[PDB]
Amino acid sequence: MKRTWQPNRRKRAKTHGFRARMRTPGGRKVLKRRRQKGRWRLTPAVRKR
Amino acid sequence: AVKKFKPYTPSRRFMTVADFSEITKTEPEKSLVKPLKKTGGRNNQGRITVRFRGGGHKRLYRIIDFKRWDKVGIPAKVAAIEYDPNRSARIALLHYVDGEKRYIIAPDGLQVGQQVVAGPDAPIQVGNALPLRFIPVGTVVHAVELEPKKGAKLARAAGTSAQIQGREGDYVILRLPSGELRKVHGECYATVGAVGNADHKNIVLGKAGRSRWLGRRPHVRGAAMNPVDHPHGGGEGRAPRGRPPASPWGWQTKGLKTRKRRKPSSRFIIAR
RNA sequence: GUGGGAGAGGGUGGUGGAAUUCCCGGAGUAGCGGUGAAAUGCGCAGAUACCGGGAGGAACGCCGAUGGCGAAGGCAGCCA
RNA sequence: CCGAGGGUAGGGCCCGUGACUGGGGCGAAGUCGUAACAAGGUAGCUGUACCGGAAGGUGCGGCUGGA
RNA sequence: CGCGGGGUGGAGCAGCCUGGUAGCUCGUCGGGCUCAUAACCCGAAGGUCGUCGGUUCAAAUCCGGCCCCCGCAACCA
RNA sequence: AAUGACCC
RNA sequence: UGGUUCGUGGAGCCAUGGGGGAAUCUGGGCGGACCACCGCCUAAGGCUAAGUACUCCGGGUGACCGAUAGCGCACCAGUAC
RNA sequence: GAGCUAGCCCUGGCCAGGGUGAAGCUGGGGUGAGACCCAGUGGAGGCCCGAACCGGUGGGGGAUGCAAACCCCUCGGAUGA
RNA sequence: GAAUGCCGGCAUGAGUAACGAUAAAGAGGGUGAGAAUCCCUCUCGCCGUAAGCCCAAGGGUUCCUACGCAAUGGUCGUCAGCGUAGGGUUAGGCGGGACCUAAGGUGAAGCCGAAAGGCGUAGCCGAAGGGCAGCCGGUUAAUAUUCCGGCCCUUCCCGCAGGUGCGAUGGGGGGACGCUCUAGGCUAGGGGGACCGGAGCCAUGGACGAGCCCGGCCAGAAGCGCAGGGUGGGAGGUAGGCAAAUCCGCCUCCCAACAAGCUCUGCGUGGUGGGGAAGCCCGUACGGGUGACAACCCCCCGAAGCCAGGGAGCCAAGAAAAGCCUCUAAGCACAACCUGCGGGAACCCGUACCGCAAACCGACACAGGUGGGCGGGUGCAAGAGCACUCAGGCGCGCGGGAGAACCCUCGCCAAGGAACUCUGCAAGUUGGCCCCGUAACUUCGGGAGAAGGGGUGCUCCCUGGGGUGAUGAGCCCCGGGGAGCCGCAGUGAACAGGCUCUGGCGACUGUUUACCAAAAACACAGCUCUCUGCGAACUCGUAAGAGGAGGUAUAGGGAGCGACGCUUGCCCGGUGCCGGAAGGUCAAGGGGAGGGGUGCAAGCCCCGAACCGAAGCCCCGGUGAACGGCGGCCGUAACUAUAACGGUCCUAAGGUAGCGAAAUUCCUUGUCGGGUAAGUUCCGACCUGCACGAAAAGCGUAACGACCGGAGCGCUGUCUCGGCGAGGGACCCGGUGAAAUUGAACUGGCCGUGAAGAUGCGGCCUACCCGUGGCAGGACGAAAAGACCCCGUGGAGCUUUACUGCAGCC
RNA sequence: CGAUGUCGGCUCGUCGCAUCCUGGGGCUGAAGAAGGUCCCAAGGGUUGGGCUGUUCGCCCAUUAAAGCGGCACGCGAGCUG
C-alpha cells in the first residue's frame, strides 16, 4: 500500500529547516536543546540544488 | 419563464434553469471596470467558521456601482444586461456620456439603449437614482442606502423592492423586502424600480450536483451525529431530540430572538 | 355601403369615497359583547363609547327600476 | 419448396371459480333517532367542499318546484 | 415467583391518609302532565362496604392471612 | 320542544 | 483582590484594578476593628560595596566505582542505529 | 506533527471505443392566428455497455504470509457530488 | 532460584518449515583451484498500452574499467547493484536563477495582545501557471539539444549609417483563459506497390517466378506555394481613464465591409548537410567491415497532435502580474529611441546511473504503492479490449528425482438435476455482432438487452453507394442479390449478460466504519419551522482582526423532514420559546427613623427600621413541521351471537385518515385462503395492534440497488456418491536453514483415589530398543495477567430538571 | 477468570439397556390372522424429504422398525458459523 513516508526535499526543508526552527520560540528552544545535547545535526540534512 | 426539461434522466425531471433571454448578446463580461480576482475560501485565518462551504464553479467578481452619487447629473446609456455569478440579480452594463463605464444592478423593465441617470434632478423612471426625499411617496424602489453616503445595502436580491410609505422630518419610512418598517434618512440614495429576475425563486435545483456547482457542501443533521458533535447526537435507533431543538453550539433554534436589545438602531425601526 | 343611437357586453391600466379591523397619540371611566334569556369572550395591565393620525384588504351606498347588455355562464363607484 | 399437425415462447378476448371485501334488491309486528311532507317547527331543493352513529349539518354560489 | 394499585345499594363513582355522619349521577317504585309513550315535575324505597381474624370504648376507614381484578417487572449470561 | 306495532 | 502565620475572621499592616479625593509640621503614616491617651516613624524619586547562591571551567582530597559498576560515552558517543 | 489520513485554497493533468438520441434549428402539415403533429438535422445527460483510471461486492487462498490488508476468480463507478 | 524480572551467552523444536509468484528449460564450447548458477553459441519457453522506451520525484556513486570473493546474494558463484583502486557528469539557445505574478507566506504604515506574540492595504517572497533564442547528425569503455559537424537564432555593450520629439515603477491596450460537441487543411504515425535498390536463396513433392527475404528516410534559413489566426480606415467634439496624453473611452459625420490590405503562425518546398536493411565475413564482454556510387519513388489509411486567440451550443459563467504595443509627465532635445550593419561581451546551479523499480516509499534483491509522454503489426464490429507477434527485454538467484495420503489451482463424467445447505455459497448454464420479436405497469423518459427466437465459416457469379483520385484506373470504406463446398461444431481459439415472477427498505447518481459492518445507515434535490435591516444573525479569536460577504430577505445562519402522489387530525394543563410601560418578590446602591463605642467636649467610629431601587422568578396570555401527550367500567336489538344506542368515572385532550401477527405481534407455527407431495419462511386476507399512526412524518409509487425475503424455469460435482486425470507442494537425494514453545522427565491402558476430569498416587492389565509417513482424541495442548461477571471508596467518554464552578448572554 | 471456545449442523465413531425392529418365551377378556401385556435378549439394523439456526416438533412418501440415553448438552490444535 501507500506508506507514510513520501519524501520531498522542499517539504522537509520548509518544515524542519534551520530557518523554520529559527522563526518561532518553540523552534529556537529546539536548537538550544539540540546544541546543549551536543547533537552533530541540529536540523535534518536536506540535500540537492 | 424558467426552462424545463423532459425526464430523459432522473433529476432532469424536476430540474429547471433560468431563462436568459434578458441576457443581451454580451455573455462574457467587461474588463476595465471589473472583474477582479475573487478569493474563494470557506473560512477565516485558519479555521472554518461557516460550515459546508466549498467546491463549485470558479468566479470573477463584477465590481458594481453601489453609490450612484458620483455621477450626479451625468446620464448614461444602458449598453447591455449580463449574467453575474456572484449575486441573484442580473447586472446592467451602462455607458456614461462621460465615457466611463459602470455596472448597475439591473432592475425589472430595464431595456437596452435606455437612458438612465442619478441625482436630485432625475425623472422618476425605472433605472434612475435619487435621494429618497425627492422620490414620490408610494413608489417602489431598490438598492437603497441605509445611511447617507455609505452605499446601497437594501433590496438588491432578485425581484426585491422596498416601498416608500411616508416621511418624518429628515427621514422617510420604508417597507423593506422582509416587511420591516424602517426610518431611513432622507438623504439616502435609492434607485426606482424593482430588482427583476423575479423568477429566481421558481428555479428547482433538481439534483445534488447543482448544489455543489454553487459551492454548497453537504449539510449534515445533528441527529446524524454523536453527543460529542451535537446536542442532537445519539442515542439509539433514531431519536426525537429530547430537549428543546438546538444549534451545535447549544443555543435554541426555534424561536430564540437573537438581535441584541440595546442596539442604538432600535429607534429607527417600526416592524417585523 | 353611408350616416347616426342606447347599453352593469369583454380585456388592460389607473383612481375615489363610506365603512369594518388593526397600530399610534389624545381625552375618559366601570363595564362592554351578546341572547329568547344567558354564558363563553373582551375589560382597572385603562376596555366599550369619543377625537386626531396611519396601515391595509375587500366590496361599491344614493342613482337603481317591476330597467339595461350579453350566445350562455354572467356584467354595477369613476377615468382613459 | 410448401405442407396437416405436434413442440416451444409470449400476447389478446371470453367463461368459470377464490379467503376476504363493497354496496344493492327483497323479506306482516326488533334498534336508534326526526331528515322530508303544513313556515314540518332551522323554507326546501341543488352543484361542490368539509365534517358527523344514522337520517344528516355547515360553507360557497344557484333555483321557485316557498313567503 | 417479585412489585403496588384495586373489590362499597341494580349500574358507575365518592367516602379511608387527619377512626364515630356512608354521599353524587343513573336506575327502581308511587303519583302528576299526555288521547298514549318518552321527555319533564312531585314524593319514596334501597348499601353483610371481597372474605377471615383484633386494635380500639367504636373499623367502610387502622394492621395482618388468604381470594379474585388491574398495571409494572423478569436484566448481564 | 320526539314518537304513534301489524293487516283490514 | 493579592502578600503576611492570618482560609472574612474582632482583620489590622504592606501592595494594588475601579470610584471619590486632601494637606506641607498646629503637615502625615504606624503601634491588629474603633476612640482617647502615651509613644515610633517621616510615604507618594534614585543609587549603594561586603557577608550570600551557583559550578560550564582549573586544582586538591576520598573507610567513592573499577567496564552489567562508575557520567548515556574509560574505546573518536549524544556516535552508530 | 496534515511528507499517512480528512477538508478546503492556487496552479496543471487525465478519462480507449462503442451505444441511446432531450432541446434547438430546418422542411412539411394543421389554424383566423396558435397550441400541436410528422420527418430530417442536431448531440443533451450526477443516461447506458466497456478499458485505462478510481473502487472493494461475493467466494476461495493466504494466517511464524509475497504482504503488520497481500493474491486469484467475481463484482460497483467510469463527463462527474 | 524464581519477580511473563534486566543484560549477555548457549540450548530445544530440527537437519524440521521454508529458500518470495506454475513465464521453463536443454545442450555444446570456453574460463577456472573450484561451474546446474560466469562468459559464448545453438534450441526452447515468457512479456510486448509491457515484463519495451522517454521524462519528473526520490535516491546519491549504485555509471564505466581494472584487480578480487571473507562477508552481503535465501543454494552455487570465477558473477554482482558487493570489497580495493582509477576514470567518468562540459550548455548564451534544455531546466532553474541575475523575469512575472497564484494560493499562501512575509510584511513598511497602521491596529492588537501580561511577556512570548497575533493581525496587517502597499512592497517583497512564492510555480508542473505566464515570459523566453536549437534543429538534424557524428563521436566516448562511461557525457552530450552540453563536445564536434552542418544548418539557424537571442540578448546586452561600443561603433558607424539612416530615421523620430525622445522619455517612466505612471494612462490605456494586450497578455487573458470555462465545459461539451465540432469544420476545413495539415503533420505525427501506419498499410500496400507490378516501381526503385540489395547481398543472397530453389530446400522435401512442386515453383527460376510481377518468387522469397531486406530496405526504400531525416533535418533544412531566405524565398516561394498551400492552409489558417489576428485585426477596420479617416475627420472632428470631449467633462471619463484620480497630473498630463495625439493614447483609450463616449458621441457625431464620412469611406470599408471585405480577412480586400497589413501582419502572425503552421505545413509543404527549398542552397545544403546527414542517414542508409537483410545477409555475408569477423575476435571482443560487444561492436566493426562489406552489402551501397544503396535506392531514397507512387498510392492509401490517418489522429486525441498542429494552424489556435478556429467554430457552434450550454450554464454552473470560467487567475494574476511581467514581457509586448501605444500614450504622455518630470526632465532632456550635443541627449535619447527606432531600423540596418560591423566588432566585442554572454555569469551562477543541474547534467553520471536507477527510475512501475534489486538503486524511490514498504527493517528484506519484499508477488504491495508510485505522476507525465511514446507504446508498432495481424485479426476478432470498434478500441489503449483479447489471441499471437516487431523492436526491445526477460525465463522472476536453490537444484535433482519421485508420481503415496492430504492440500491448493485445474479439466472431465453414467443416470438423476438443489434431493446439498442457514442460503444454489460455490461452480456451471448465459455470453460478441446483425436481424426478427417483446407484457404488466408507468411519472410517457421508461420498463428493454424484457422474455423468446433465427443468422454467423469458406468458394464462385451478378450487382448498389460513397472516399481519394480528372468525370477513369487502382487503392479504401460501407451494402444488396443468386448459386455452391466442408466439418460434430463457422463471434470453430482468446475477450463478452443466466432469466422471470413477487414482496421489504431506501426515490434515484452518489457517501461511509484506511485494517471484520457498503447497509434499510449518511448525503441528496424538495418541504416546513425559526433566527438575521446589515458594523446582520452566527462562527473563530483575550484583543486586533477575519469568515458570513466585497453578499443584503428571491439573501445569510440554525433545525427537522427527505424525489414525487394523496395527506399530515385533537390537547397549550406541565417544559421550552414568544408577547405583556399592572402587580408580588428581588442585589449592590440611595435613604436615613432609631441604637451602640470612645472622648471634658467639639468630635471621630460603628451597626440600622420605613421608603426609593434592575434583570431573573412569580403572575396574565400566546405558541405543536416547539419538548411532548392523544383513557376506563357496566348495560342494550322479537333464536342465539354481536352492539348502531345508553349510563357513569376521569383527563389538558382521550389516536382521525390511512396501515396493521408488520425491520413493530409477547401468547404465536394466531385464524382462514394461496404456492408445496409435504411450507415455524413467503404471499393474500381477517384484526384479539402485549407495544403502528401522520415532517424522529403517515399510506402509497414508475425507475433505480454488488442491499434483505419468497418462488419458478434454465443449468450444473451443491448433493445421491463418488471416480479419474492435470500441474504446484507434500515424499526421497544434494546445498542453505528458521519459529513459537520449553520446571525437569526414564512421559502406557482400566477401575479407583486425590482440590471434586491423573503418564507421575493404589490395585490390576498391558508393554523388547529406535525411528519414518500420516490422523488429531489427550497432555484441563500454544497463543494473549478474561473481553463477560464481580471487586477497587481504580480511569476515562457520554447525559441530565445531580452538585459546584467557568465561558457566554442578560 | 497469568482463558476449560460457548448452540445447532457435519464428519467420524463408541458404549448403557430402562429394546424401536428382527430372535426366544409366559399370560391374555389368545378361534385364526392381527393385537394387548410382561419376561429373556442388545448380534445386527434403525429411510428419504417439506418448515425453522434450530434442539425438539409438525407434516409428506415409505418401512421390519424410523428406540431412548452417556461419552466436557461426545467430537471447532477436524470443518462449518
Ligand SMILES: NC[C@@H]1O[C@H](O[C@H]2[C@@H](O)[C@H](O[C@@H]3[C@@H](O)[C@H](N)C[C@H](N)[C@H]3O[C@H]3O[C@H](CO)[C@@H](O)[C@H](O)[C@H]3N)O[C@@H]2CO)[C@H](N)[C@@H](O)[C@@H]1O
Ligand atoms: N327497503 C329498500 C331500501 O333499503 C332500506 O330498507 C331496509 C331496512 O332499512 C328496513 O328495516 C326496517 C326498519 O327501517 C324499520 N324502522 C323497522 C322494520 N322492522 C325493519 O324491517 C325489515 O326487517 C324485518 C325483520 O327483520 C322484515 O320482516 C321486514 O320485511 C324488513 N323491511 O328494511 C328494509 C329491507 O326490506 C332503506 N331504508 C330503504 O329506504 C331503501 O329503499
Ligand SMILES: [Mg+2]
Ligand atoms: Mg483564526
Ligand SMILES: [Mg+2]
Ligand atoms: Mg498561519
Ligand SMILES: [Mg+2]
Ligand atoms: Mg442533511
Ligand SMILES: [Mg+2]
Ligand atoms: Mg450515528
Ligand SMILES: [Mg+2]
Ligand atoms: Mg452535548
Ligand SMILES: [Mg+2]
Ligand atoms: Mg428506538
Ligand SMILES: [Mg+2]
Ligand atoms: Mg419518549
Ligand SMILES: [Mg+2]
Ligand atoms: Mg438526542
Ligand SMILES: [Mg+2]
Ligand atoms: Mg389608544
Ligand SMILES: [Mg+2]
Ligand atoms: Mg376472474
Ligand SMILES: [Mg+2]
Ligand atoms: Mg322534520
Ligand SMILES: [Mg+2]
Ligand atoms: Mg326544516
Ligand SMILES: [Mg+2]
Ligand atoms: Mg332541514
Ligand SMILES: [Mg+2]
Ligand atoms: Mg350544500
Ligand SMILES: [Mg+2]
Ligand atoms: Mg358542523
